[PDB]
Design a protein around this motif. Sequence first.
Motif, PDB file in Angstrom:
ATOM      1  N   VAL A  99      19.559  35.487  37.394  1.00 34.24           N
ATOM      2  CA  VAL A  99      19.180  36.700  36.677  1.00 34.24           C
ATOM      3  C   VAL A  99      18.909  37.854  37.650  1.00 34.24           C
ATOM      4  O   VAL A  99      18.954  39.022  37.253  1.00 34.24           O
ATOM      5  N   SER A 100      18.689  37.628  38.952  1.00 32.44           N
ATOM      6  CA  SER A 100      18.542  38.763  39.852  1.00 32.44           C
ATOM      7  C   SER A 100      19.869  39.463  40.156  1.00 32.44           C
ATOM      8  O   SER A 100      19.890  40.502  40.813  1.00 32.44           O
ATOM      9  N   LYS A 101      21.001  38.943  39.661  1.00 38.13           N
ATOM     10  CA  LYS A 101      22.259  39.664  39.780  1.00 38.13           C
ATOM     11  C   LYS A 101      22.335  40.768  38.714  1.00 38.13           C
ATOM     12  O   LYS A 101      23.307  41.539  38.650  1.00 38.13           O
ATOM     13  N   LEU A 102      21.366  40.844  37.793  1.00 36.59           N
ATOM     14  CA  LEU A 102      21.442  41.834  36.736  1.00 36.59           C
ATOM     15  C   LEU A 102      20.472  42.974  37.011  1.00 36.59           C
ATOM     16  O   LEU A 102      19.287  42.762  37.285  1.00 36.59           O
ATOM     17  N   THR A 103      20.965  44.209  36.990  1.00 34.15           N
ATOM     18  CA  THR A 103      20.124  45.379  37.146  1.00 34.15           C
ATOM     19  C   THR A 103      19.468  45.576  35.785  1.00 34.15           C
ATOM     20  O   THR A 103      20.169  45.619  34.764  1.00 34.15           O
ATOM     21  N   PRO A 104      18.133  45.630  35.721  1.00 37.15           N
ATOM     22  CA  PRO A 104      17.376  45.781  34.486  1.00 37.15           C
ATOM     23  C   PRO A 104      17.778  47.044  33.750  1.00 37.15           C
ATOM     24  O   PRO A 104      17.886  48.102  34.376  1.00 37.15           O
ATOM     25  N   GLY A 105      18.061  46.957  32.455  1.00 37.87           N
ATOM     26  CA  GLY A 105      18.450  48.127  31.712  1.00 37.87           C
ATOM     27  C   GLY A 105      19.948  48.338  31.694  1.00 37.87           C
ATOM     28  O   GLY A 105      20.434  49.037  30.792  1.00 37.87           O
ATOM     29  N   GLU A 106      20.717  47.767  32.634  1.00 40.79           N
ATOM     30  CA  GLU A 106      22.151  48.000  32.632  1.00 40.79           C
ATOM     31  C   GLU A 106      22.811  47.145  31.561  1.00 40.79           C
ATOM     32  O   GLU A 106      22.416  46.001  31.350  1.00 40.79           O
ATOM     33  N   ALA A 107      23.745  47.717  30.813  1.00 43.60           N
ATOM     34  CA  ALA A 107      24.538  46.986  29.856  1.00 43.60           C
ATOM     35  C   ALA A 107      25.667  46.329  30.637  1.00 43.60           C
ATOM     36  O   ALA A 107      26.299  46.984  31.481  1.00 43.60           O
ATOM     37  N   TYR A 108      25.915  45.050  30.369  1.00 40.29           N
ATOM     38  CA  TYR A 108      26.977  44.298  30.997  1.00 40.29           C
ATOM     39  C   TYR A 108      27.901  43.782  29.913  1.00 40.29           C
ATOM     40  O   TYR A 108      27.486  43.464  28.787  1.00 40.29           O
ATOM     41  N   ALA A 109      29.169  43.718  30.294  1.00 37.68           N
ATOM     42  CA  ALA A 109      30.233  43.284  29.420  1.00 37.68           C
ATOM     43  C   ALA A 109      30.386  41.768  29.412  1.00 37.68           C
ATOM     44  O   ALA A 109      30.356  41.181  30.497  1.00 37.68           O
ATOM     45  N   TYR A 110      30.474  41.081  28.275  1.00 42.24           N
ATOM     46  CA  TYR A 110      30.898  39.701  28.324  1.00 42.24           C
ATOM     47  C   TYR A 110      32.088  39.664  27.385  1.00 42.24           C
ATOM     48  O   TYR A 110      32.082  40.275  26.299  1.00 42.24           O
ATOM     49  N   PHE A 111      33.140  38.968  27.817  1.00 41.97           N
ATOM     50  CA  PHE A 111      34.419  38.962  27.118  1.00 41.97           C
ATOM     51  C   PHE A 111      35.198  37.688  27.411  1.00 41.97           C
ATOM     52  O   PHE A 111      34.808  36.900  28.279  1.00 41.97           O
ATOM     53  N   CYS A 112      36.283  37.481  26.674  1.00 43.80           N
ATOM     54  CA  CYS A 112      37.129  36.324  26.846  1.00 43.80           C
ATOM     55  C   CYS A 112      38.388  36.777  27.566  1.00 43.80           C
ATOM     56  O   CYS A 112      39.034  37.706  27.096  1.00 43.80           O
ATOM     57  N   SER A 113      38.782  36.180  28.694  1.00 40.92           N
ATOM     58  CA  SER A 113      39.952  36.584  29.458  1.00 40.92           C
ATOM     59  C   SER A 113      41.214  35.772  29.169  1.00 40.92           C
ATOM     60  O   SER A 113      42.230  35.889  29.876  1.00 40.92           O
ATOM     61  N   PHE A 114      41.138  34.915  28.128  1.00 43.42           N
ATOM     62  CA  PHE A 114      42.260  34.124  27.650  1.00 43.42           C
ATOM     63  C   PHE A 114      43.340  35.117  27.224  1.00 43.42           C
ATOM     64  O   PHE A 114      42.975  36.195  26.737  1.00 43.42           O
ATOM     65  N   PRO A 115      44.647  34.875  27.423  1.00 46.52           N
ATOM     66  CA  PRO A 115      45.738  35.754  27.031  1.00 46.52           C
ATOM     67  C   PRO A 115      45.569  36.376  25.668  1.00 46.52           C
ATOM     68  O   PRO A 115      45.285  35.661  24.715  1.00 46.52           O
ATOM     69  N   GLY A 116      45.644  37.701  25.581  1.00 40.15           N
ATOM     70  CA  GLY A 116      45.531  38.404  24.319  1.00 40.15           C
ATOM     71  C   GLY A 116      44.111  38.601  23.862  1.00 40.15           C
ATOM     72  O   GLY A 116      43.863  39.523  23.087  1.00 40.15           O
ATOM     73  N   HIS A 117      43.155  37.813  24.346  1.00 39.11           N
ATOM     74  CA  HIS A 117      41.764  37.899  23.928  1.00 39.11           C
ATOM     75  C   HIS A 117      40.833  38.983  24.484  1.00 39.11           C
ATOM     76  O   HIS A 117      39.951  39.428  23.729  1.00 39.11           O
ATOM     77  N   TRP A 118      41.010  39.505  25.709  1.00 41.79           N
ATOM     78  CA  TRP A 118      40.006  40.368  26.338  1.00 41.79           C
ATOM     79  C   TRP A 118      39.498  41.632  25.632  1.00 41.79           C
ATOM     80  O   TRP A 118      38.335  42.021  25.763  1.00 41.79           O
ATOM     81  N   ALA A 119      40.343  42.319  24.875  1.00 45.09           N
ATOM     82  CA  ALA A 119      39.936  43.549  24.236  1.00 45.09           C
ATOM     83  C   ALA A 119      39.305  43.287  22.882  1.00 45.09           C
ATOM     84  O   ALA A 119      38.684  44.181  22.304  1.00 45.09           O
ATOM     85  N   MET A 120      39.457  42.093  22.333  1.00 44.29           N
ATOM     86  CA  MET A 120      38.888  41.818  21.032  1.00 44.29           C
ATOM     87  C   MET A 120      37.668  40.921  21.078  1.00 44.29           C
ATOM     88  O   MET A 120      36.666  41.103  20.373  1.00 44.29           O
ATOM     89  N   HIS A 121      37.780  39.929  21.945  1.00 43.46           N
ATOM     90  CA  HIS A 121      36.764  38.930  22.060  1.00 43.46           C
ATOM     91  C   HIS A 121      35.786  39.391  23.137  1.00 43.46           C
ATOM     92  O   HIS A 121      35.942  39.079  24.324  1.00 43.46           O
ATOM     93  N   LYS A 122      34.766  40.152  22.722  1.00 43.18           N
ATOM     94  CA  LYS A 122      33.791  40.732  23.640  1.00 43.18           C
ATOM     95  C   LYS A 122      32.403  40.996  23.055  1.00 43.18           C
ATOM     96  O   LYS A 122      32.160  40.804  21.863  1.00 43.18           O
ATOM     97  N   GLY A 123      31.468  41.425  23.894  1.00 49.34           N
ATOM     98  CA  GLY A 123      30.120  41.752  23.474  1.00 49.34           C
ATOM     99  C   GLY A 123      29.357  42.352  24.655  1.00 49.34           C
ATOM    100  O   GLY A 123      29.929  42.571  25.733  1.00 49.34           O
ATOM    101  N   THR A 124      28.062  42.602  24.505  1.00 46.49           N
ATOM    102  CA  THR A 124      27.267  43.207  25.552  1.00 46.49           C
ATOM    103  C   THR A 124      25.988  42.392  25.806  1.00 46.49           C
ATOM    104  O   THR A 124      25.326  41.911  24.878  1.00 46.49           O
ATOM    105  N   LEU A 125      25.613  42.197  27.067  1.00 47.89           N
ATOM    106  CA  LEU A 125      24.406  41.485  27.429  1.00 47.89           C
ATOM    107  C   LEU A 125      23.557  42.461  28.229  1.00 47.89           C
ATOM    108  O   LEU A 125      24.114  43.304  28.945  1.00 47.89           O
ATOM    109  N   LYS A 126      22.229  42.399  28.107  1.00 49.92           N
ATOM    110  CA  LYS A 126      21.311  43.234  28.878  1.00 49.92           C
ATOM    111  C   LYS A 126      20.076  42.415  29.196  1.00 49.92           C
ATOM    112  O   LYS A 126      19.710  41.503  28.451  1.00 49.92           O
ATOM    113  N   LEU A 127      19.437  42.767  30.302  1.00 46.52           N
ATOM    114  CA  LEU A 127      18.195  42.175  30.704  1.00 46.52           C
ATOM    115  C   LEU A 127      17.117  42.847  29.860  1.00 46.52           C
ATOM    116  O   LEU A 127      17.273  43.991  29.427  1.00 46.52           O
ATOM    117  N   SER A 128      16.054  42.120  29.559  1.00 43.17           N
ATOM    118  CA  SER A 128      15.023  42.545  28.634  1.00 43.17           C
ATOM    119  C   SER A 128      14.586  43.924  28.313  1.00 43.17           C
ATOM    120  O   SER A 128      14.180  44.729  29.152  1.00 43.17           O
TER     121      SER A 128
END
Lengths: 129, 129
Positions: A99-128
Amino acid sequence: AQCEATIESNDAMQYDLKEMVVDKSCKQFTVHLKHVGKMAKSAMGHNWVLTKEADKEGVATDGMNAGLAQDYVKAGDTRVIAHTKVIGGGESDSVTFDVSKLTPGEAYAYFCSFPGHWAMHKGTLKLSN
Amino acid sequence: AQCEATIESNDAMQYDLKEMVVDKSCKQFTVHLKHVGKMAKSAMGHNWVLTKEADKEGVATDGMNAGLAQDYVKAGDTRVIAHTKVIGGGESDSVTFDVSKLTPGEAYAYFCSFPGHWAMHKGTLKLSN
Ligand SMILES: [Cu+2]
Ligand SMILES: [Cu+2]
């Protein structure tokens, strides 16, 4: 749970969670990815990759280029904070990250890199918050 | 080819071969099953099992009661001459067997022992016809 979360994928291109929060007191966080649909990974495989928003496209590009044996993530990519394997229906995989790899407050991308999936299969993670 | 044959199973319970002939100049024979369907093994798993035709149902039944983890074959079943593991969509598996276990002109039964699949198809294997 507390510093752990389960997110699900199925035979469509969306995770059940489109947002995730890591609690600030977590030293490590574990994501458990479950593929709850019935298609095999050659047809509808999925993974969970976490990057900084700006790195999402480069990781997805080099990701699809890396092939299924690399779980569609370029081997040892410095821009990948954490990633799971590619799984198919009925399977799951977990990843624990620092968790120290995450800058507090920064929005980070989580997504699927499987062929065809990256632009649809996604979401956002943030530290508290 | 030679002393090898490949058989494909899709997402309907059938093989693309209904008769397999092992040739008498073969000391060993290798079957390569390919599950060319797209569903996961929990949904549409397939395998290839070889028994004598009189034993097809007993092996299938005990196999069903052995479970997916035991590749739907009862462990060390004296009636199984050869079997692969149960595989999923986009997968392949191979089993090699010694042709001295087969008797001249005797018809053998090959089948998938995944519940139900055995009863909705018939496939025969003989030595050189
Ligand atoms: Cu996906
Ligand atoms: Cu089958």
